[PDB]
């Protein structure tokens, strides 16, 4: 995350984090026994018995009290994935998570409803500061961007036909904070007037923090038929 803040996992204690030891990507507890994120996070060692997944980790490499350890009984991959990544969305069973102040489950949200452009959401991850920087944050961050609308990131200048209507794109209006290398997986929660949802997840984009170019994110609310037919 650029810019933004630290926090600890009270403050998303839905967000899981992956290795395989070294950190891979972010995650969300959507059940007991499941937690999403990014296909392009696994794509390359598609193996599940080479996984770690904690829940209630505030930290990267230091345990955080209270924290859970999971074996990775199932990893779904999305069958239509391509690489800008299309269908960036897996899912993996976890062996299951017992609730607490520091581990918590997030809502997926209704069918194609998702907040109006302009809106506020926060996006959280272990990834870089600085896109300059080699080492990844010990302590887990957290920012805010705003949700720009399809019209405008699919745009020449801003990323043309690379984004398609299950991608929403999400940015600073000073392009000051982003997501970036690291945060992949990792969830993009926006309040649905009442609830906290999981509106998307940190999929890609050109670079971090650069003007016109905004992070993007796979539209959780395209995909609950292969979230329900997998769970």
């Known amino acids: ?23 891979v990507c ?30 209630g980790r505030s930290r990267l490499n230091s345990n955080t009290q209270g924290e859970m350890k999971f074996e990775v009984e199932n990893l779904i991959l999305h069958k239509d994935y391509s690489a800008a990544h299309h269908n960036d969305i897996a899912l993996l069973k976890i062996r299951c998570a017992q609730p607490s102040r520091t581990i918590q489950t997030i809502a997926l949200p209704s069918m194609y409803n ?51 209507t299950k991608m929403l794109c999400a ?14 997986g990792g969830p993009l929660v926006c309040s649905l007037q009442g609830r906290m949802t999981l509106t998307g997840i940190v999929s890609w984009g050109r670079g971090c923090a650069l003007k016109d170019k905004p992070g993007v994110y796979t539209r959780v609310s395209h995909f609950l038929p292969w979230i329900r037919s997998h769970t």
């Open 1 to 23: 995350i650029i810019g933004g803040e630290f926090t600890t996992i009270e403050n998303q204690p839905w967000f899981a984090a992956i290795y395989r030891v070294t950190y």
């Open 26 to 55: 972010g995650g969300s507890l959507i059940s007991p026994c499941w937690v999403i994120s990014a296909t392009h996070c696994f794509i390359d060692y598609p193996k599940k018995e080479d996984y770690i997944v904690y829940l």
């Open 114 to 164: 998702d907040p109006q452009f302009g809106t506020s959401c926060e996006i959280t991850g272990f990834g870089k500061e600085q896109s300059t920087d080699y080492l990844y944050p010990e302590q887990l961050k957290m920012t805010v961007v705003k949700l720009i609308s399809h019209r405008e990131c699919q745009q020449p200048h801003y990323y043309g036909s690379e984004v398609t």
């Open 171 to 184: 940015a600073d209006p000073q392009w000051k904070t982003d997501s970036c290398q690291g945060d992949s």
